[PDB]
A paper describes a structure:
Mutation of the RT-loop sequence E88AIHHE to VSWSPD (‘NI1-2’) or YSPFSW (‘NI1-3’) led to an increase of the [name] binding affinity to 179 nM or even 48 nM, respectively, indicating the enormous contribution of this region to the PxxPxR recognition of the [name] domain. In addition, two long antiparallel helices α4 and α5 (residues Y85-K98 and Q108–Q122) of [name] form a characteristic hydrophobic interface for interactions. The accessible surface of helices α4 and α5 is separated into two parts by the highly conserved residues F94 and W117, whose aromatic side chains oppose each other and act as gatekeepers to form a barrier in the helical region. The mutant residues V90SWSPD of the [name] RT loop undergo tight interactions with the proximal region of these antiparallel helices, with tryptophan 92 of [name] contributing itself to the high binding affinity with 41 interactions to six different residues of [name] within a shell of 4 Å. Many of these interactions were mediated by stacking of the aromatic side chains W92Hck to F94Nef, as well as facing interactions to W117Nef. In addition, R81Nef in the PxxPxR motif of [name] showed direct ionic interactions to D96 of [name] and the side chain of Q122Nef made tight interactions to the hydroxyl group of Y89Hck (2.6 Å) and the main chain oxygen of V90Hck (2.9 Å). Likewise, the hydroxyl group of S93Hck was hydrogen bonded to D90Nef (2.6 Å) and D95Hck formed an ionic interaction to K86 of [name]. The 8-fold increase in affinity of the [name]-[name] RT-loop mutant VSWSPD compared to the EAIHHE wild type sequence is largely due to multiple interactions mediated by the central tryptophane residue. While the site proximal to the PxxP motif harbors the central residues of the RT loop, the distal site covers a newly identified N-terminal helix of [name] (residues 60 to 69) with W61 mediating multiple interactions to hydrophobic residues L104, I113 and L114. Of note, the acidic cluster motif of four successive glutamates (E66–E69), that was reported to interact with the sorting adaptor protein PACS1, adopts a helical conformation on this structure element.
The [name] protein is an accessory gene product of [name] and SIV that is dispensable for virus spread in experimental ex vivo cell culture systems. Thus, [name] is an important factor for AIDS pathogenesis. To achieve this multitude of activities, [name] has evolved as versatile adaptor for protein interactions that lacks intrinsic enzymatic activity, which allows the viral protein to affect a wide range of host cell protein sorting and signal transduction processes. We thus chose a strategy aimed at wrapping the surface of [name] by the combination of different, physically linked, target domains and the iterative optimization of domain composition and linker segments.
Residue numbers in the entry:
A (entry chain B): 79 to 138
B (entry chain A): 56 to 155, 179 to 205
Amino acid sequence: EDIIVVALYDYVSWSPDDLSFQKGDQMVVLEESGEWWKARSLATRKEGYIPSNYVARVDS
Amino acid sequence: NADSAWLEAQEEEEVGFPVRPQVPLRPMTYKAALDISHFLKEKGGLEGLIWSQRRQEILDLWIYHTQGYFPDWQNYTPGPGIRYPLTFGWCFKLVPVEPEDAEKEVLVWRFDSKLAFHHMARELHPE
């Protein structure tokens, strides 16, 4: 099932490949290879890389 | 008036105390350098800035602090004349200007879209 994370800080992307988010946004984690994870925004449905230390995993 | 890449970088170095963690390190690539070039072009503040070694370091540290790129990718070919970026993808070059009397070269940062397609550092050297 879905890995859900909550943003602890705002993050501004400088690239179409990276995903901007605001503190408190929830995201689904699609890939966790290294420290930059691929995620999808539940708000905007846009997808891309995020800094994993800006988010907290919740649930289960 | 814009909202400047230079003024943000400069203010971060002076205060030095972020409200959020340092993003993880990741390697520089052609696509990241290209994307950062376009972002800073559109943001404003780097185009036309008068070059110094300290200014370049301030900007490199800001890019490192914000996006995680270790600050050793922003190198240029040696003078004299135009200095071309050694990292292919980075679309800024350093251009001599008329001093507006010295005599050391005053340089400005200049965006150049042809740098996305012509690795001039390599098409003009061999290292």
